[PDB]
Design a protein around this ligand. Sequence first.
Ligand SMILES: N[C@@H](CSOO)C(=O)O
Ligand SMILES: [Fe+2]
Length: 186
Amino acid sequence: ELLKPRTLADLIRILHELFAGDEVNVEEVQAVLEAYESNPAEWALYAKFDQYRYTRNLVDQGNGKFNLMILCWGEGHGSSIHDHTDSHCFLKLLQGNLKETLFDWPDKKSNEMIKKSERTLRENQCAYINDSIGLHRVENVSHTEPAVSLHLYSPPFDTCHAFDQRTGHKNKVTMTFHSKFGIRTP
Ligand SMILES: N[C@@H](CSOO)C(=O)O
Ligand SMILES: [Fe+2]
């Protein structure tokens, strides 16, 4: 039975229940994420920005079935085109706006990766991606407003691939946490 999360802490509690088993009800998880009304005081601890690129800040380790993290995107900061390592990946905006651009998996032949579509993700909205849907790039295109998002990945993963937009060629990248549980982890 899905109830509205009252706070971030409550959201976390609910996620532990939703991931208590071996499978994932994606629509239920997306609904609970969307229903949490972003309260900046509750996540300020995790919102650690870097001037030069976006940061990944671990919030909860999900007793193994998922990682929950907060990403902080300076003006103009964005990601590579990337996959999600056979995991579910949910992305809920906590502050600002992000542009998500979707791409198809490249063919083995070198070619420009053309965007299949794009959308603007707005405050409190929760998006979902997985490898079966495709690849994406996420960017804060604002010149004036930092963005903050909440991401949930299941199973957790710390490697993915970045794709070169001109060729489709991929490279394996290891993701790192800028902080964990509010603590900077250089
Ligand atoms: N997958 C990217 C963020 S865009 O993913 O919802 C990352 O975790 O760094
Ligand atoms: Fe992503």
